[PDB]
Symmetry: C2
Subunit: 51 residues, 2 copies
């Protein structure tokens, strides 16, 4: 899947510290556990075929 | 392990947005792959015992 995220560091900007300007992320999201449940625990097609 | 990390959002109060003040993390760090290599591929004590 793809979700929401955030990348942001060192504005190199203004005269007082802790600055950090934000940019927005296109980001690769991966399920590991929900995907497994979908494959074998929610739908039982794969399981039946393999059996 | 425990390492270094970073949590940071919304400094709250400039004329421009994209402010974002940083806070520092105590953070639980987990190896998954390096730990496995240490357990069985770097040192072979566990392996020998099980064999």
């Amino acid at each position: 899947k793809e979700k929401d995220a955030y990348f942001y560091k060192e504005s190199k900007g203004f005269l007082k510290k802790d600055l950090y300007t934000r940019y927005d992320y296109k980001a690769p999201y991966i399920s590991s556990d929900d995907a497994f449940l979908a494959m074998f625990y929610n739908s039982d097609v794969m399981s039946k075929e393999f059996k």
